[PDB]
Design a protein around this motif. Structure first.
Motif, PDB file in Angstrom:
ATOM      1  N   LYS B 293      43.385  38.095  36.185  1.00  0.00           N
ATOM      2  CA  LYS B 293      42.810  37.539  37.404  1.00  0.00           C
ATOM      3  C   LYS B 293      41.711  36.522  37.090  1.00  0.00           C
ATOM      4  CE  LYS B 293      39.753  41.514  37.844  1.00  0.00           C
ATOM      5  NZ  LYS B 293      38.660  40.623  37.364  1.00  0.00           N
ATOM      6  N   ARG B 294      40.485  36.823  37.512  1.00  0.00           N
ATOM      7  CA  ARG B 294      39.365  35.924  37.291  1.00  0.00           C
ATOM      8  C   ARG B 294      38.975  35.894  35.816  1.00  0.00           C
ATOM      9  NH1 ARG B 294      35.325  37.665  42.326  1.00  0.00           N
ATOM     10  NH2 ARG B 294      36.978  38.156  43.840  1.00  0.00           N
ATOM     11  N   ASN B 295      38.344  34.791  35.421  1.00  0.00           N
ATOM     12  CA  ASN B 295      37.835  34.607  34.067  1.00  0.00           C
ATOM     13  C   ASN B 295      36.885  33.418  34.089  1.00  0.00           C
ATOM     14  OD1 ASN B 295      39.595  32.094  32.876  1.00  0.00           O
ATOM     15  ND2 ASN B 295      40.824  33.392  34.238  1.00  0.00           N
ATOM     16  N   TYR B 296      36.090  33.295  33.028  1.00  0.00           N
ATOM     17  CA  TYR B 296      35.146  32.191  32.923  1.00  0.00           C
ATOM     18  C   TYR B 296      35.006  31.784  31.463  1.00  0.00           C
ATOM     19  CZ  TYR B 296      31.854  35.995  31.842  1.00  0.00           C
ATOM     20  OH  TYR B 296      31.237  37.099  31.302  1.00  0.00           O
ATOM     21  N   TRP B 297      34.305  30.671  31.249  1.00  0.00           N
ATOM     22  CA  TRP B 297      34.103  30.097  29.925  1.00  0.00           C
ATOM     23  C   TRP B 297      32.620  29.831  29.717  1.00  0.00           C
ATOM     24  CZ3 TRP B 297      38.624  28.793  26.938  1.00  0.00           C
ATOM     25  CH2 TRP B 297      39.829  28.959  27.633  1.00  0.00           C
ATOM     26  N   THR B 298      32.099  30.238  28.564  1.00  0.00           N
ATOM     27  CA  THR B 298      30.704  30.022  28.210  1.00  0.00           C
ATOM     28  C   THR B 298      30.619  29.194  26.937  1.00  0.00           C
ATOM     29  OG1 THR B 298      30.493  32.028  26.865  1.00  0.00           O
ATOM     30  CG2 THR B 298      30.091  32.233  29.233  1.00  0.00           C
ATOM     31  N   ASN B 299      29.614  28.324  26.875  1.00  0.00           N
ATOM     32  CA  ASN B 299      29.340  27.553  25.666  1.00  0.00           C
ATOM     33  C   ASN B 299      27.894  27.094  25.726  1.00  0.00           C
ATOM     34  OD1 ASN B 299      29.304  25.940  23.393  1.00  0.00           O
ATOM     35  ND2 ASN B 299      31.242  24.907  23.854  1.00  0.00           N
ATOM     36  N   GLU B 300      27.101  27.482  24.725  1.00  0.00           N
ATOM     37  CA  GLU B 300      25.696  27.104  24.686  1.00  0.00           C
ATOM     38  C   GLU B 300      25.478  25.690  24.166  1.00  0.00           C
ATOM     39  OE1 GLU B 300      23.569  30.094  22.535  1.00  0.00           O
ATOM     40  OE2 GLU B 300      23.897  31.635  24.065  1.00  0.00           O
ATOM     41  N   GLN B 301      26.493  25.074  23.567  1.00  0.00           N
ATOM     42  CA  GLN B 301      26.416  23.667  23.207  1.00  0.00           C
ATOM     43  C   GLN B 301      26.570  22.802  24.451  1.00  0.00           C
ATOM     44  OE1 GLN B 301      25.558  22.458  20.360  1.00  0.00           O
ATOM     45  NE2 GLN B 301      25.615  24.364  19.176  1.00  0.00           N
ATOM     46  N   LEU B 302      25.886  21.660  24.453  1.00  0.00           N
ATOM     47  CA  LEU B 302      25.883  20.743  25.593  1.00  0.00           C
ATOM     48  C   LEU B 302      26.118  19.317  25.110  1.00  0.00           C
ATOM     49  CD1 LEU B 302      22.850  22.176  27.620  1.00  0.00           C
ATOM     50  CD2 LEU B 302      25.282  22.648  27.963  1.00  0.00           C
ATOM     51  N   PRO B 303      27.362  18.977  24.746  1.00  0.00           N
ATOM     52  CA  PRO B 303      27.668  17.578  24.415  1.00  0.00           C
ATOM     53  C   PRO B 303      27.691  16.687  25.648  1.00  0.00           C
ATOM     54  CG  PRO B 303      29.650  18.906  24.314  1.00  0.00           C
ATOM     55  CD  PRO B 303      28.509  19.865  24.488  1.00  0.00           C
ATOM     56  N   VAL B 304      28.114  15.439  25.474  1.00  0.00           N
ATOM     57  CA  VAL B 304      28.180  14.516  26.599  1.00  0.00           C
ATOM     58  C   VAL B 304      29.557  14.533  27.260  1.00  0.00           C
ATOM     59  CG1 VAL B 304      27.563  12.193  27.343  1.00  0.00           C
ATOM     60  CG2 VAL B 304      26.578  13.136  25.239  1.00  0.00           C
ATOM     61  N   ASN B 305      30.614  14.774  26.486  1.00  0.00           N
ATOM     62  CA  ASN B 305      31.981  14.824  26.992  1.00  0.00           C
ATOM     63  C   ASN B 305      32.297  16.227  27.498  1.00  0.00           C
ATOM     64  OD1 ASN B 305      35.098  15.423  26.366  1.00  0.00           O
ATOM     65  ND2 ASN B 305      34.851  13.246  26.854  1.00  0.00           N
ATOM     66  N   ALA B 313      34.407  26.264  24.133  1.00  0.00           N
ATOM     67  CA  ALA B 313      33.894  27.306  25.009  1.00  0.00           C
ATOM     68  C   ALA B 313      34.625  28.621  24.773  1.00  0.00           C
ATOM     69  CB  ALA B 313      34.032  26.888  26.473  1.00  0.00           C
ATOM     70  N   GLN B 314      33.879  29.720  24.849  1.00  0.00           N
ATOM     71  CA  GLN B 314      34.434  31.057  24.686  1.00  0.00           C
ATOM     72  C   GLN B 314      34.857  31.604  26.045  1.00  0.00           C
ATOM     73  OE1 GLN B 314      35.411  32.950  22.329  1.00  0.00           O
ATOM     74  NE2 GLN B 314      34.931  35.116  22.672  1.00  0.00           N
ATOM     75  N   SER B 315      36.083  32.114  26.118  1.00  0.00           N
ATOM     76  CA  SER B 315      36.642  32.623  27.364  1.00  0.00           C
ATOM     77  C   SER B 315      36.317  34.106  27.507  1.00  0.00           C
ATOM     78  CB  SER B 315      38.153  32.398  27.409  1.00  0.00           C
ATOM     79  OG  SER B 315      38.708  32.903  28.611  1.00  0.00           O
ATOM     80  N   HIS B 316      35.660  34.464  28.607  1.00  0.00           N
ATOM     81  CA  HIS B 316      35.348  35.851  28.926  1.00  0.00           C
ATOM     82  C   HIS B 316      36.060  36.229  30.217  1.00  0.00           C
ATOM     83  CE1 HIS B 316      32.027  35.705  25.950  1.00  0.00           C
ATOM     84  NE2 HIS B 316      31.830  34.490  26.432  1.00  0.00           N
ATOM     85  N   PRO B 317      36.995  37.174  30.198  1.00  0.00           N
ATOM     86  CA  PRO B 317      37.679  37.561  31.436  1.00  0.00           C
ATOM     87  C   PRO B 317      36.741  38.263  32.407  1.00  0.00           C
ATOM     88  CG  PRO B 317      38.980  38.150  29.513  1.00  0.00           C
ATOM     89  CD  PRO B 317      37.616  37.789  29.013  1.00  0.00           C
ATOM     90  N   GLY B 318      37.138  38.247  33.675  1.00  0.00           N
ATOM     91  CA  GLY B 318      36.364  38.860  34.736  1.00  0.00           C
ATOM     92  C   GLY B 318      35.603  37.842  35.560  1.00  0.00           C
ATOM     93  N   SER B 319      34.751  38.366  36.435  1.00  0.00           N
ATOM     94  CA  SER B 319      33.916  37.521  37.276  1.00  0.00           C
ATOM     95  C   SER B 319      32.714  37.015  36.490  1.00  0.00           C
ATOM     96  CB  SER B 319      33.447  38.286  38.512  1.00  0.00           C
ATOM     97  OG  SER B 319      32.584  37.489  39.306  1.00  0.00           O
ATOM     98  N   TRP B 320      32.335  35.761  36.742  1.00  0.00           N
ATOM     99  CA  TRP B 320      31.169  35.193  36.078  1.00  0.00           C
ATOM    100  C   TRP B 320      29.859  35.749  36.615  1.00  0.00           C
ATOM    101  CZ3 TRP B 320      27.507  32.542  38.870  1.00  0.00           C
ATOM    102  CH2 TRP B 320      27.879  32.130  40.156  1.00  0.00           C
ATOM    103  N   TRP B 321      29.904  36.559  37.677  1.00  0.00           N
ATOM    104  CA  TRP B 321      28.686  37.160  38.207  1.00  0.00           C
ATOM    105  C   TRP B 321      28.018  38.065  37.182  1.00  0.00           C
ATOM    106  CZ3 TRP B 321      31.306  38.795  43.464  1.00  0.00           C
ATOM    107  CH2 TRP B 321      31.601  37.631  44.183  1.00  0.00           C
TER     108      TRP B 321
END
Ligand code: COA
Lengths: 388, 351
Positions: B293-305, B313-321
């Motif tokens: 179902k729901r999932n989200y992506w996290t990444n602490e790097q902040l490029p321009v593109n 980005a690392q994919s974490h399943p579930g709600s981003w809440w």
């Protein structure tokens, strides 16, 4: 974004002739054998020419050159203090006839099928009249896209035409200035934007949401300029006086202009949902083409931009055709047969027997006399409007 | 469309000429001491999922133990036709922040602004730091645009001719080709950028909703200053409450979320707005996927593109809440027992 050279107008071709006003483009053949009789394109000068050559999907130039037509095109040059005293007679002389003679010298053929769009249909038909007055055998076919032959009963353009400004420009007819693209946008581009947005929302109500055509809006926002004598002549003699319905009421290039004389088979297309200029005004012209042996009329499904340009590779909407030509347009619409897919195919058929036999495509662009100057799109199309 | 959904309890604790502050009844024994404020768009009913018909998000975060407040903007009345953006900053966000800091006796708070409301919060920040007013310790933007460079499909419509046409309005044979900002097109733009659900042209909400009832000065200011001028990315392009707007003057941690499939708000544009918050100590962007179902992506790097951010980005399943809960819990202070009374004595609970 949209860059003219890179993602638009990418249809391969070379500038095979340049004028002080125009740039003729001979498009590179994409078929093994083409139709012997060439096909000349007369785009409008209100905006830029590339409405017929946007993207390879909806590029009418790339499409028809892909069907097997020797596709030539007239690229108009934005106004410049060098061209402050240009008139309609110059756009007929150094515009249509120059490119026509150039095609005749390149292809070594006598006749050619022509096509006019928006104002290019008015310039085209006037050039056809001056071509029938002086015995110049240039064209064996004619085609008019959403162009008005009868300018009585015009569109909403009349609501934005200043009589006192046209008269004041007639006071300074000699040494005329240059009409800024801003005003021509007030009279043309803005209204086409309103009709394009409205018709897009309507098409999103009828059918599901379709991708928005940003290329059309980019073509509409890229405005050019025009000389004061020719533009003032256009507003005075056509959208106000309407000197095309009265034979001989107008006289240019030392020639009086009557529509009945035209003896060339004429194909006419007119968008139906065109709110800026209703298709009845365009249909009100075939009754003045009494001397033409053949006549065709085609009702286009959408607006001016969206309906004028419907790619065959997509076949999005329908079009209406029938041979009858009554005085009342609703009688034409009732006895009209509907056909799916874009209307270009129909015109394709209407050009199949007229284009003569087939000939292997010329593997050399230009000729020994006309060397290819620079590849398409060229230089005049990349012009920018003059700053205030 | 035949909805069977829960109700979220809440009483009105503060009211004025423009907004209404709703304090939600706590459901946890010990809650985080620092409160949490919700800033919706300047519209009473926005019809965004998880918030307007159901309000599942507030219910969930109160379930996690947070003192949640919401800024319920009042419906449009003829007395609100003269308000401007500076009023929505002044009497809108700052007044609610004062009400929260007086009811909870806490000076700072965590701010959350989604959709157009987030933009408002942004501007409010650039005013507060300019006037030394310490209201928020952090700000969060959910599906909000700071860089209006690529608005999306709606850029096909918005221009000066549209806004000027609507400003005019407000003749026997002429059609709509001379009236660009007709109610159809204008309502399509307004409803398209101000609502979480896009009504069909044959719907009653398409022609009579709160977004069309918003005063015209707000539509002119938002369509011109943001969707046309993009005054946020340029320092000092707009002046609010006598304050030039500099995004580099935001000194609080920033969390940003953007749904991947929202064709209204391109997540690449919300991500594009991140490089302009150079003054913020830290920035976290999380991309959310609906999952057809729901999932989200996290990444602490902040490029321009943005695509480069998505690739690593690392994919974490579930709600981003959960992710925003872990990002927000340390900045929420200690844990205190839930206040058994909504509002206070000086701020009695309304109805
Ligand atoms: C959610 C969204 C992607 C839906 O697109 P879609 O695929 O066309 O689906 P619809 O809009 O027709 O919604 C269909 C489904 O959503 C549900 N739905 C819609 N709005 C809802 C809401 N507010 N709360 C709960 N469910 C909702 C229904 O289930 C409906 O039927 P289905 O479950 O059988 O599919 C689109 O509504 C959206 O994302 N809008 C975002 C608004 C926005 O970006 N606003 C800017 C900030 S205000």
């Amino acid at each position: 974004p949209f860059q003219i050279g890179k993602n638009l107008v990418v249809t391969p071709g070379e500038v095979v002739f340049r004028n002080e006003l125009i740039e003729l483009i001979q498009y590179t053949p994409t078929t093994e054998k083409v139709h012997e009789k060439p096909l000349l394109f007369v785009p409008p000068c209100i905006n830029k020419y590339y409405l017929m050559d946007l993207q390879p999907d909806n590029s009418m130039v790339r499409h028809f050159v892909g069907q097997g037509y020797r596709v030539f095109l007239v690229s108009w040059r934005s106004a410049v203090p060098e061209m402050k005293n240009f008139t309609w007679e110059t756009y007929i002389e150094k515009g249509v006839f120059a490119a026509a003679e150039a095609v005749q010298k390149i292809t070594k053929q006598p006749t050619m099928n022509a096509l006019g769009f928006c104002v290019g249909g008015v310039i085209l038909t006037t050039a056809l009249c001056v071509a029938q007055a002086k015995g110049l055998k240039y064209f064996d076919s004619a085609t008019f896209m959403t162009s008005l032959i009868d300018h009585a009963e015009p569109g909403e353009i009349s609501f934005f035409i200043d009589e006192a400004l046209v008269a004041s420009r007639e006071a300074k007819m000699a040494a005329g200035g240059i009409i800024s693209g801003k005003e021509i946008g007030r009279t043309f581009a803005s209204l086409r934007a309103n009709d394009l947005v409205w018709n897009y929302v309507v098409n999103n109500y009828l059918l599901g949401k379709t991708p928005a055509p940003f290329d059309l809006l980019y073509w509409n926002n890229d405005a050019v300029d025009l000389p004061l004598p020719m533009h003032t002549f256009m507003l005075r003699q056509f959208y106000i006086n309407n000197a095309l319905i009265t034979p001989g009421a107008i006289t240019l290039c030392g020639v009086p202009i009557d529509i009945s004389k035209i003896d060339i088979p004429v194909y006419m297309f007119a968008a139906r949902e065109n709110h800026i200029v209703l298709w009845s005004s365009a249909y009100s012209g075939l009754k003045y083409l009494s001397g033409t042996p053949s006549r065709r009329f085609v009702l286009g499904a959408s607006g001016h931009i969206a309906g004028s340009i419907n790619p065959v590779t997509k076949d999005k909407r329908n079009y209406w055709t029938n041979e009858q030509l009554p005085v009342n347009p609703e009688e034409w619409l009732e006895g009209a047969q509907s056909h799916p897919g874009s209307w270009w195919k129909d015109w394709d058929a209407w050009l199949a027997p007229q284009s003569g036999k087939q000939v292997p495509a010329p593997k050399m662009l230009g000729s020994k006399e006309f060397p290819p100057l620079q590849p398409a799109p060229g230089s005049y199309v990349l012009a920018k409007a003059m700053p205030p």
